[PDB]
Amino acid sequence: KTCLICGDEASGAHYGALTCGSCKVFFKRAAEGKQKYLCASRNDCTIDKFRRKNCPSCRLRKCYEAGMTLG
Amino acid sequence: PQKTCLICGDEASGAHYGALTCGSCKVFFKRAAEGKQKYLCASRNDCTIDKFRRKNCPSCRLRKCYEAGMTLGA
DNA sequence: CCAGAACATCAAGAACAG
DNA sequence: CTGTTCTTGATGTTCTGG
Ligand SMILES: [Zn+2]
Ligand SMILES: [Zn+2]
Ligand SMILES: [Zn+2]
Ligand SMILES: [Zn+2]
């Protein structure tokens, strides 16, 4: 019943596994406009309801990594 | 011959609340400075703040400030 | 020159529309 | 569900009085 990216709330399957409302919207806007998001630390940046915004780079790869795509 | 931000690195504005800050940094501080922002760091309070990633970790940023010795006036 | 106020952006997460 | 638009907090850049 929970997201597999941020771990918050699941809304359904989108471009792959379960995602939160935002993780859905994020993944697209993100992977499409190809923006080299660079982590600010050591890439392990824990992502969740509270922090997911803090670092697109880490969030984004968590997507590809946890299975996700555009088609 | 260029003055640089002691916090973000962007083009420095002036001596604000304590040090050579960038435009935003000045403001950024004052706002959060005294307020319940409750910013949360991602990793270990040791991120690297530069003009293009200052938005990422507020916590670290502000902390860097307090560390650089900024202030409002006690 | 600087601390603030005032006016202007960005972008994330929610609410919609098809 | 997926594509698009709206709302709003967090930020940024100008404009002001002392
Ligand atoms: Zn999520
Ligand atoms: Zn990160
Ligand atoms: Zn700065
Ligand atoms: Zn941080």
Number of domains in chain A: 1
Tokens of B61: 């940023």
- The 10 Å Cβ neighbour count of residue A5 is 27
Chain B hits for A58, CB-CB cut-off 8 Å, are 42
Total number of residues shown for chain A: 71
Strands B19-22 and B12-16: antiparallel
**Computed from CA positions of residues B66, B68, B73, B74, in that sequence, does the dihedral angle turn out positive or negative?**
positive
| A15 Cβ nearer than 7 Å to chain D strand | yes
Q: How was this structure determined?
A: X-ray
Question: In CATH, what number is assigned to the domain containing residue B38?
Answer: 3.30.50.10
B73, β-bridge pairs: none
A vs B, Cβ pairs < 8 A, gives 35
CA distance B12 to B8: 9
Q: Does B62 touch chain A (CB under 8 A)?
A: no
Six token digits for residue B13: 């504005």
Q: What resolution does the deposited structure have, in angstroms? A: 3.1
Are the CB atoms for B33 and B72 separated by under 8 Å?
yes
Residue A48: give the domain boundaries. 1-71
Nearest-angstrom CA–CA distance, A28 and A23:
9
